[PDB]
Design an enzyme around this catalytic site. Structure first.
Site, PDB file in Angstrom:
ATOM      1  N   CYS C  99       0.839  -1.212   0.000  1.00 31.54           N
ATOM      2  CA  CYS C  99       0.000   0.000   0.000  1.00 31.54           C
ATOM      3  C   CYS C  99       0.878   1.268   0.000  1.00 31.54           C
ATOM      4  O   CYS C  99       1.565   1.478   1.007  1.00 31.54           O
ATOM      5  CB  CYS C  99      -0.944   0.032   1.209  1.00 31.54           C
ATOM      6  SG  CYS C  99      -1.903   1.587   1.309  1.00 31.54           S
ATOM      7  N   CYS C 103      -3.024   7.521  -2.547  1.00 35.22           N
ATOM      8  CA  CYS C 103      -4.325   7.517  -3.221  1.00 35.22           C
ATOM      9  C   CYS C 103      -5.467   8.121  -2.370  1.00 35.22           C
ATOM     10  O   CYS C 103      -6.369   8.706  -2.989  1.00 35.22           O
ATOM     11  CB  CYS C 103      -4.744   6.077  -3.564  1.00 35.22           C
ATOM     12  SG  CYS C 103      -3.354   5.023  -4.100  1.00 35.22           S
ATOM     13  N   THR C 190      -4.121   4.136   7.292  1.00 35.98           N
ATOM     14  CA  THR C 190      -2.835   3.732   6.709  1.00 35.98           C
ATOM     15  C   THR C 190      -2.041   4.988   6.319  1.00 35.98           C
ATOM     16  O   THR C 190      -2.592   5.857   5.655  1.00 35.98           O
ATOM     17  CB  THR C 190      -2.991   2.838   5.467  1.00 35.98           C
ATOM     18  OG1 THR C 190      -3.797   1.685   5.763  1.00 35.98           O
ATOM     19  CG2 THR C 190      -1.665   2.220   5.015  1.00 35.98           C
ATOM     20  N   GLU C 257      -0.876   1.032   9.762  1.00 33.86           N
ATOM     21  CA  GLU C 257      -2.080   1.693  10.247  1.00 33.86           C
ATOM     22  C   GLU C 257      -1.941   2.233  11.659  1.00 33.86           C
ATOM     23  O   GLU C 257      -1.190   1.693  12.466  1.00 33.86           O
ATOM     24  CB  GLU C 257      -3.254   0.697  10.282  1.00 33.86           C
ATOM     25  CG  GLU C 257      -3.741   0.204   8.960  1.00 33.86           C
ATOM     26  CD  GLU C 257      -2.858  -0.787   8.203  1.00 33.86           C
ATOM     27  OE1 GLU C 257      -2.331  -1.741   8.815  1.00 33.86           O
ATOM     28  OE2 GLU C 257      -2.748  -0.583   6.974  1.00 33.86           O
ATOM     29  N   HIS C 292     -12.253   5.401  -4.182  1.00 37.62           N
ATOM     30  CA  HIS C 292     -11.364   4.439  -3.527  1.00 37.62           C
ATOM     31  C   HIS C 292     -11.641   3.035  -4.092  1.00 37.62           C
ATOM     32  O   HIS C 292     -10.715   2.238  -4.310  1.00 37.62           O
ATOM     33  CB  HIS C 292     -11.480   4.479  -1.992  1.00 37.62           C
ATOM     34  CG  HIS C 292     -10.226   3.998  -1.312  1.00 37.62           C
ATOM     35  ND1 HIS C 292     -10.073   3.859   0.044  1.00 37.62           N
ATOM     36  CD2 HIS C 292      -9.041   3.590  -1.842  1.00 37.62           C
ATOM     37  CE1 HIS C 292      -8.861   3.409   0.333  1.00 37.62           C
ATOM     38  NE2 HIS C 292      -8.213   3.236  -0.801  1.00 37.62           N
ATOM     39  N   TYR C 296      -8.813   0.418  -6.277  1.00 36.08           N
ATOM     40  CA  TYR C 296      -8.373  -0.973  -6.093  1.00 36.08           C
ATOM     41  C   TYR C 296      -8.168  -1.713  -7.389  1.00 36.08           C
ATOM     42  O   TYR C 296      -7.352  -2.645  -7.449  1.00 36.08           O
ATOM     43  CB  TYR C 296      -9.395  -1.744  -5.248  1.00 36.08           C
ATOM     44  CG  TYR C 296      -9.530  -1.193  -3.851  1.00 36.08           C
ATOM     45  CD1 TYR C 296      -8.428  -0.838  -3.092  1.00 36.08           C
ATOM     46  CD2 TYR C 296     -10.788  -1.032  -3.289  1.00 36.08           C
ATOM     47  CE1 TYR C 296      -8.568  -0.342  -1.814  1.00 36.08           C
ATOM     48  CE2 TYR C 296     -10.950  -0.526  -2.009  1.00 36.08           C
ATOM     49  CZ  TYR C 296      -9.826  -0.182  -1.285  1.00 36.08           C
ATOM     50  OH  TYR C 296      -9.983   0.319  -0.014  1.00 36.08           O
ATOM     51  N   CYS C 299      -4.409  -0.596  -7.943  1.00 37.02           N
ATOM     52  CA  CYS C 299      -3.368  -0.961  -6.990  1.00 37.02           C
ATOM     53  C   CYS C 299      -3.310  -2.473  -6.718  1.00 37.02           C
ATOM     54  O   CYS C 299      -2.195  -3.046  -6.662  1.00 37.02           O
ATOM     55  CB  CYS C 299      -3.483  -0.173  -5.664  1.00 37.02           C
ATOM     56  SG  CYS C 299      -4.627  -0.866  -4.455  1.00 37.02           S
ATOM     57  N   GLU C 455      -7.356  -5.836   3.912  1.00 36.88           N
ATOM     58  CA  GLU C 455      -7.846  -4.523   3.427  1.00 36.88           C
ATOM     59  C   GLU C 455      -8.663  -4.678   2.157  1.00 36.88           C
ATOM     60  O   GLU C 455      -9.580  -3.897   1.852  1.00 36.88           O
ATOM     61  CB  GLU C 455      -6.687  -3.535   3.229  1.00 36.88           C
ATOM     62  CG  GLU C 455      -7.035  -2.078   3.031  1.00 36.88           C
ATOM     63  CD  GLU C 455      -7.542  -1.626   1.683  1.00 36.88           C
ATOM     64  OE1 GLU C 455      -7.339  -2.368   0.688  1.00 36.88           O
ATOM     65  OE2 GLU C 455      -8.185  -0.541   1.547  1.00 36.88           O
TER      66      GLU C 455
HETATM   67  S1  SF4 Z   1      -5.932   2.488  -3.330  1.00 40.10           S
HETATM   68 FE1  SF4 Z   1      -4.534   0.713  -2.750  1.00 40.10          FE
HETATM   69  S2  SF4 Z   1      -2.322   1.572  -2.603  1.00 40.10           S
HETATM   70 FE2  SF4 Z   1      -3.882   3.229  -2.688  1.00 40.10          FE
HETATM   71  S3  SF4 Z   1      -4.302   3.887  -0.412  1.00 40.10           S
HETATM   72 FE3  SF4 Z   1      -5.912   2.384  -1.123  1.00 40.10          FE
HETATM   73  S4  SF4 Z   1      -5.065   0.199  -0.644  1.00 40.10           S
HETATM   74 FE4  SF4 Z   1      -3.337   1.662  -0.550  1.00 40.10          FE
END
Ligand code: SF4
Ligand SMILES: Cc1cc2nc3c(=O)[nH]c(=O)nc-3n(C[C@H](O)[C@H](O)[C@H](O)COP(=O)(O)OP(=O)(O)OC[C@H]3O[C@@H](n4cnc5c(N)ncnc54)[C@H](O)[C@@H]3O)c2cc1C
Ligand code: SF4
Ligand code: SF4
Ligand code: SF4
EC number: 4.2.1.120
Lengths: 490, 490, 490, 490
Positions: C99, C103, C190, C257, C292, C296, C299, C455
């Site tokens: 992570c 983002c 996080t 976190e 968000h 995903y 990422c 997550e």
């Molecule tokens: S989108 Fe993925 S890399 Fe970006 S803050 Fe969320 S879990 Fe982390």
């Protein structure tokens, strides 16, 4: 010009197509109850293009002949065009809940256009020009062209030129100065009987020894030597019953398959798109299959919209629409169906121009689309059967629901007993409830299960076909280098 | 005394059963092409009990009258009897690939036997004696008794005594000094038309307001006021075609359903097993469904064995039998099928005696068995479809394969072209390959798909019906205490 | 101005952030071994923006300040912008396998931007001006802003204004002329510890009774009364071991976190973006979570690429790479991972402008992307564990592999025996093999499993949260009408 | 006699076992924090045997020595014995939620007993008598015997005799008049360090070229030349934290693995059970693996009971226990867990006697058991993570929950803020809620995840190992004949 639905039907009646079923020639096949549903289904592609509410999506100005044409005959000029094709297909699936057939012409036109350009580049032939002038004629006359790739194939362990019978893949058997003669057949051809023309392509990459099987061309549906043998469908002969309506599930629309036999057909030089250049057959296969795999992220999703709607309606009619598990199953069906759409749109959005100029999809993402198509329609159907209940497969005939035959102690009829005992929630009549349960029977096990379940498995290739190409297109050795970097390996 | 198959079929022609289909009364229903497959399938239970090879499994000594009887009429006396029942069912599934119907009689006898003992213990009634004398008569004459539990049910959101039409659950409408009069219907009844008797049971637990619905009894299949309306099946009318054979997939065997109407039927007192003791309706449901849920761990597994066999044979006939992915899919099919068998066998091994003395299965494990039944048959068929290929659903009719109609330039007939083009590996004739492909069509989509798929979903309760009971039988609170101990919570 | 990676790290050393772990304040947290991997991971978003090969994807011209900025701070201006965000996120997941945190900043800026515009149109407030001036400061200075939405939440059966303790959702406790005072906490955050600022948003739609919980603002990470308590991670203290390297699996990068506590923190008027307009709390929630959920699809797919590469390499090292089943499992991992990517790209391509003018994703398709994220990473890990073998979880420590302690009869050392016995194919040294197996241990069970598995399950909402919205967005009643038309129902 | 748990632990203190970890020899391994949970776990097999409430299931009369023994040392005399083994393992899984290790002794005794009988019949050797005299010693002393089968294996594509290093499978390196000398290692050995003895078996069928690898024997755990190297586990060093308790999840119990090295160990003649009779190695493998595959049907189901209890209790503590989707997921976990139990019980009930006289499981059904074990524990954990929420992986340390460090404006401590903010429903204290969340972290990602997930995947062989034998055991050719019969094929 664009034909109306009515003009489309009248044009078929003037064709001399040879159609056989149950050992006999069908003279008036256009009106035959076991064939007319597939004709009404492709007729919708003409009908919506006449409606102003859909004309923008259904039609477009041809860059080839400078006039408006049906979008089912256009060469893609951008990724926006690739996305509109998928949305058009979702629309037609919602309107028919079946296979509306015309996509194979669209997809063959784009694959042949691009492949013929590169064949000519190498060999100095003129196939691209042959094809370009042919597409002008189709665009001028709004005709249906059946794309035909899959041969019967014989022994699955052997190459085309290793078969005991050399006719089991379609091949050239004579080269003349004015044309060629071909012999063989193409199986499983949905909509062939109601097409004006056929465009043929080879089914697999070819080596030099297989070079006579590396052949591609177009021809009229009533060409000398060409005939069709209908293929059976689950519940097909319910359409022959007098008054057939409720027990059909889908009275107006359907899709049907035939074996297309070429008993020594002569093709003139200007209709030929490939003739023994064995090194370009696998290119033709890859690009046509890719477009067809993209296509399923539209058509199957449109049909899935209707299955979801029919299961939800059944739950209302039964009276069980407030139950948590029924709501959760409908969400699952929606979720799987929209995942298919996502793959169709994504392989469109990531497309690119070919050397010929027209646009093509991301082949890896189209393969992932199709691989999911071999799994999720089957689960969408299983959840629909749960929600509907047992009566979708145990229901008495429609003739029984309307029968005046007396069977009760006080003069009650069979029809009286049927309408009484299969009543349910106040929101429907008994006949309304039976109509939506027959719709579900037809697509879960009947004539439409052939398209929604089994064509989803094998259309544009059985699952293993995509898995082989996903491995090649996966870049796995590049991914091993990413892992080395993170784990500390030189 | 045991009847031969021939004697069973002769015993049916003496019955006065009223059978209706498509609005007409069927006089000679024993020979009707759409009904006789059903009869041949149950007739195999008689045939194998006459074979010394299977004599041990198929027969046993009655603990009520001492004589040798068919195991399908026996009260279980140990967990060894429960395992043998499952094995008997796997055998019949292997021999017919269909529903052989007689299990519902067996399962109703064992549930009504144990439940009536407990009703009488509480109320001072005589239903246990009524049932015991009835089962002696059946045991003496080797007859088929249709177990019938599922009502049409009307509005799924309402109790039986709250329906707008009080007849949509079966009910007591009159009580006389010599017996009762009942009115209503039982839907989805497989093999009802070719049974000698019926045994009726309520479909859900009942409150005091629902007490007129807490009824159980037995009656001859031609009692006055009782009649049946045939339910349609996918591809049912293929059986009416002249010379129908290859296109049926399973020509000998099948299992068909009907709506059973009780138009004011009188039941004498000695045939009553439950009459308004609403607090025991739920016990009858729980035990009858519990044994039927066990039964599927034998019958669906034996049908599954044939599907696995047919898919493997199709791979040999196609010529693709050496491919790793085909071998892996046959292994997956085998694995899922044997998992079902393990649930069937384990709920049997963990059985126990009821107060009445006969043995019953572990209710939780039987619910787990049926929950997997609602899933794995559907995946077994999807994998079979993959292995078979597309011709399973696009094949020309058998009349086309047999047709001498001339259509080829050099006098070739429709039959010659079909036999030529659909040839494959040297291990088969074309006709042999078409026969196994049609068997698969019939069980994946056609008439046998009704039983192997949709009755697996809903037979003995839709999936949510077991989930509710698994929660209750799960011991969740005891498990929370296990967790507290390990996590160091007081 | 863009900061280099080294300037980002030195900027952190000037902050007065309050960080606590195991009961003690950490003064030099920038170099603490359990926190520095988080910093190294965010630092890659600065490093890659300095490389000309990636500079085009990593940077863009801001319409707001008229200079080139990091794309992680940009307001989306088109669907092309939405697709580039996903591609940038796949790149960073390939480069870190973890992570990389930034983002949540990007996604909070687009959601707060579009939401505050509409608050102001309805109420006559000036939160949109507060927000655009704040974003100018962040874009000029290249800072990290941690988006903080999820409260601890208390009793999950009660609303915020009904909790026993009113502090369990963050709330306004005082309104002054110059600003407000807030009290509460945000959990699971996080990258909170290594951010320059925080942007707070409510976690659920709010009613009038909950209006003191309808609050959004930004503050510096060292605001007076603000402090963080570190959360534990699987295998976290392996980082404290002297010379830790191979046993970490991913030495350079991670994501950690913390609980962010607001102990009566003052927010000045200019930093406030929502203050008791309860009817817009759910708007902020839907748009931030929708972005968000889109994230995903980029990422987790980039991380998935590294897992696939690691399994494939382990197979090469073990010497099982030519096995058909291993090949097929890598194809399944590839298929599932690319399905996720399709959902990320499609919800981007089908995006549209808000009233404020920045672009937003299709919310239904983003919900479908996240629902598949809750499933497919768990299956990718399971197949990776199969391919790796048992040694990934039973391997001796790196201290044993380098140990010179003598244990063999002829002087062999512990390290000698470990390097001997865990050798395999010549493709790798023993150490190389151990490195890739420890990478897999760390992402399948260890520190990276927290993000790739759990997550994926709960980030941007538990799976039921998306299922609720998929039902609302699914157009189910319109789909019922499609079924009526096909089935012949008025 | 039978030892008490305390006597077992004391007996270990007298062994001279050689144990190494992080480069160092551990002298007092019996009290070492990273090893004692393993010892407590096996100690429960002694404790339960002393308990009258459990003694009948935990102990049995030996037909070999005529005295009462722990059932973990018994030779099976019936299918009832086989079912009781499974039920004893479910009980121990409920009591420890971990790997209690002693099963491998039980399973090795029965497989070696039956195999040695047949070796002796063919070769005139004395191995059966060697073994029976050995088991009498073990039964009279109540000792733990580690069954060790899996070697490190080197290049997976090559046979033992084709390895570049001949010691990567255990082999005979010298033959003397009084015994043999062996060299090599066994990997992944759970509970090896706290066993009294070891029993070695080969890991694969062997050809004549591999005859030096066809070796089986038993030896004391402190035999000259034998030593162990500890293998790491996820989260292992949390056990080294001062006062470790809540953050361990399972403070009392665990199961650890070691590499067992045989550095030229002498084995006397009377301790040898196989010595170069290569044609019997495959028999020993099949029988030991089949019994261990059966065992998982009990042990993983008992552990699964605790995971189901912990997720249900977490929902109560969070306050979400009334939600229908939570209830449905607990039902799903229960269903999959009991499916495993059915396979365990079924392969037991369908057992049979060997030529030697002891009973063996049905090998096909044990293979089906273990194939489901590679799938369902992974899904049971994924659903538990959903129900628990994200705090299970982001929670602060227990040291923080107890910290008196002042951080609040009003003097509040770190511990005050933790106990305040992580409160939830009134049914728990914050500490009780954190204890159950930590139990779930430990078995979903930490130390118990090694056993419940990854040993379920690989123990008693990777998934492909069972699939190969299911194809051989599936009677596919007999099934083809069933399909021919039904389809009308000669
Ligand atoms: S989108 Fe993925 S890399 Fe970006 S803050 Fe969320 S879990 Fe982390
Ligand atoms: C926690 C745990 C506890 C264990 N406890 C014990 C124990 O106490 N006693 C014991 O003796 N063992 C124990 N085992 C070891 C276990 O039996 C094995 O992990 C497994 O049988 C041996 O495989 P491997 O670890 O060498 O993996 P590999 O064999 O390297 O397997 C990795 C993969 O490669 C594939 N592969 C490997 N070889 C081939 C081939 N020839 N052809 C095709 N594919 C191939 C496998 O199918 C798999 O997908 C334990 C394992 C674990 C994880
Ligand atoms: S299956 Fe779908 S894409 Fe193919 S022709 Fe039919 S409607 Fe079109
Ligand atoms: S579905 Fe199975 S168990 Fe039920 S009656 Fe038919 S063959 Fe028997
Ligand atoms: S994994 Fe299970 S069967 Fe094997 S030794 Fe451990 S507790 Fe026993």
């Amino acid at each position: 010009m664009l034909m109306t639905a009515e003009q489309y039907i009248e044009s078929l009646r003037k064709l001399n197509t040879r159609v056989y079923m149950f050992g006999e020639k069908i003279e008036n096949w256009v009106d035959h109850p076991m064939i007319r549903p597939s004709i009404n289904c492709v007729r919708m592609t003409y009908e919506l293009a006449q409606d102003p509410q859909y004309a923008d999506l259904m039609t477009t100005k041809s860059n080839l002949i400078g006039k408006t044409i049906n979008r089912f005959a256009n060469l893609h000029q951008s990724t926006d065009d690739l996305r509109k094709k998928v949305k058009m297909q979702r629309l037609l699936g919602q309107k028919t809940a079946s296979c509306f057939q015309r996509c194979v012409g669209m997809d063959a036109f784009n694959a042949v256009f691009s492949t013929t350009y590169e064949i000519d580049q190498k060999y100095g032939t003129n196939y691209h020009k042959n094809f370009t002038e042919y597409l002008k004629y189709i665009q001028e006359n709004d005709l249906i062209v059946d794309g035909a790739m899959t041969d019967p194939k014989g022994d699955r362990g052997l190459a085309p030129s290793a078969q005991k019978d050399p006719d089991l893949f379609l091949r050239i058997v004579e080269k003349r100065e004015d044309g060629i003669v071909v012999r063989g057949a193409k199986a499983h051809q949905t909509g062939s009987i109601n097409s004006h023309e056929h465009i043929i392509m080879p089914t697999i990459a070819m080596t030099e020894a297989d070079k006579d099987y590396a052949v591609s061309f177009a021809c009229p549906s009533d060409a000398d030597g060409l005939f069709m043998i209908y293929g059976r469908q689950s519940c097909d002969t319910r359409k022959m019953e007098e008054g057939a309506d409720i027990d059909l599930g889908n009275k107006q629309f359907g899709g049907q398959e035939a074996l297309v036999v070429f008993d020594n057909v002569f093709i003139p030089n200007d209709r030929i798109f490939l003739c023994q250049e064995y090194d370009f057959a696998g290119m033709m296969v890859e690009r046509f299959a890719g477009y067809h795999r993209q296509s399923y992220g539209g058509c199957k999703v449109g049909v899935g919209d209707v299955v979801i709607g029919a299961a939800a309606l059944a739950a209302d009619y039964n009276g069980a629409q407030k139950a948590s598990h029924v709501k959760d199953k409908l969400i699952e069906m929606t979720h799987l169906n929209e995942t298919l759409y996502c793959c169709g749109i994504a392989c469109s959005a990531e497309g690119y121009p070919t050397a010929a100029g027209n646009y093509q999809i991301d082949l890896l993402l189209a393969n992932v689309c199709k691989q999911n198509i071999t799994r999720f329609p089957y689960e969408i159907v299983r959840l629909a059967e749960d929600i509907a209940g047992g009566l979708m497969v145990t229901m008495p005939s429609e003739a029984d629901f309307k029968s005046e035959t007396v069977v009760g102690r006080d003069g009650e009829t069979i029809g009286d007993f049927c309408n009484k005992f299969f009543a349910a929630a106040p929101t429907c009549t008994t006949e309304e409830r039976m109509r939506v349960l027959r719709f579900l029977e037809n697509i879960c096990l009947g004539a439409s299960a052939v398209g929604y379940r089994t064509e989803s498995m094998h259309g544009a290739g059985s699952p293993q076909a995509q898995r082989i190409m996903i491995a090649r297109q996966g870049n796995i050795n590049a991914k091993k280098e990413l892992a080395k970097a993170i784990a500390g390996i030189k």
